């Protein structure tokens with residue numbers, strides 16, 4: 001369970017993301033795909049993309065990054081009270097998309113990497129620790145829902 005102070009560190013960097021969620025989403029999805037190419041294969045929608053340049057030029061990838069980060073932001077703004085937001089997400093990701101917890105760990109790493117690069121002013125060590133805790137909580141709760149839904153993750 002995060003403290004209020006930790007949540008405030010999370011939300012203060014998220015405020016920066018929200019200056020340009022689209023650009024942040026591009027960087028995060030591209031970092032995920034570059035660092036863990038098997039994750040790209042998981043997206044039938046995107047797996048044709050061959051290069052970072054093609055990724056950057058895809059309007060469709062940009063749209064999806066906005067969707068992803070806005071969903072995550074809505075979860076983070078609940079400060080742990082995210083049951084309602086996690087239900088549909090866990091169901092789609094367990095049963096339609098089939099995303100293992102290890103891949104949610106990979107996107108978490110990509111989020112931390114991009115925030116660390118873009119936001120040294122709001123992403124020092126304590127802030128990164130807080131974000132890690134928030135993403136750990138998200139993954140813990142999603143993995144519990146995966147169980148309940150019949151997916152090992």
Ligand code: HEM
Nearest residue numbers: 039042043045067068071072088089092097099103104107
């Ligand atoms: C922070 C973690 C993530 C969030 C918040 C998130 C959010 C979303 C949202 C909101 C959608 C659209 C609605 C839905 O289907 O549920 C979606 C779709 C999808 N997600 Fe995620 N996602 C996350 C991580 C991942 C990861 C790590 C992968 C794969 C490695 C993945 C694969 C997919 C796929 C395949 C779709 C469908 C894309 C399409 O064909 O339109 N997601 N995600």
